[PDB]
Design a protein around this ligand. Structure first.
Ligand SMILES: Nc1ncnc2c1ncn2[C@@H]1O[C@H](COP(=O)(O)OP(=O)(O)OC[C@H]2O[C@H](O)[C@H](O)[C@@H]2O)[C@@H](O)[C@H]1O
Ligand SMILES: NC(=O)c1cccnc1
Length: 180
């Protein structure tokens, strides 16, 4: 019943960056609906105040696999090399991580939605999702799984290593919804 002590994040950026610097959110837009619909992320206004994570490692693997498959399709069509490297970061959650579901229900029951119209064509999703407000320090980042895909040979290689900067502290995600 406790909030998760560990969450996961798929990101394209390599540990030389992330292990040293942590994750910082795009900007100061802490509207939960705009984030969960994807409107404030990289593909939208790139100003979200949240860093998305999941209590489900499988969720982040599916996400990684989708991006890898896009590279595979690009090579098959002559519009890419097929090369892809994706990373799944294992992260210790603390009180600055908020459950997406509870944050979403509170938000939309108060200010409402506009389904399909917040981002265009997007519904708000949130199942195993946890939102870190503004930043995840490098000290929270435990390890990474590196998935390397050779675009021409098709071989996929997976390796794992820990972050020297990780600090073992006793924390878990916030039990409460995010409120602005
Ligand atoms: N601060 C940054 N600086 C440079 N690149 C960044 C930065 N943040 C992200 N990227 C790059 O931007 C890429 C995407 O990271 P993100 O914008 O956080 O979005 P998501 O993928 O977590 O999903 C966010 C929400 O959207 C959907 O609704 C989801 O379900 C979530 O609810 C990173 O891999 C990096 O290449
Ligand atoms: N970037 C991610 O791993 C992620 C986790 C949960 C929801 N959306 C994105």
């Amino acid at each position: 019943g406790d909030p998760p002590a560990t969450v996961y994040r798929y990101d394209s950026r390599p540990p030389e960056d992330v292990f040293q610097n942590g994750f910082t959110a795009w900007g100061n837009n802490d509207n939960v609906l705009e984030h969960l619909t994807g409107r404030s992320s990289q593909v939208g206004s790139s100003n979200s105040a949240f860093v998305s994570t999941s209590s489900s490692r499988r969720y982040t693997e599916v996400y990684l696999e989708h991006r890898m498959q896009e590279a595979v399709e690009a090579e098959r069509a002559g519009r890419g090399t097929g090369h892809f490297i994706g990373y799944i970061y294992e992260v210790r959650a603390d009180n600055n991580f908020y459950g997406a579901a509870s944050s979403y229900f509170e938000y939309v029951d108060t200010y409402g939605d506009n389904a399909g119209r917040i981002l265009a064509g997007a519904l708000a999703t949130y199942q195993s999702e946890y939102l870190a407000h503004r930043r995840i320090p490098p000290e929270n980042i435990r390890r990474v799984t590196r998935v390397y895909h050779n675009g021409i040979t098709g071989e996929t290689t997976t390796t794992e290593y820990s972050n020297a900067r990780y600090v073992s502290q006793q924390t878990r995600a916030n039990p409460n919804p995010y409120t602005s």
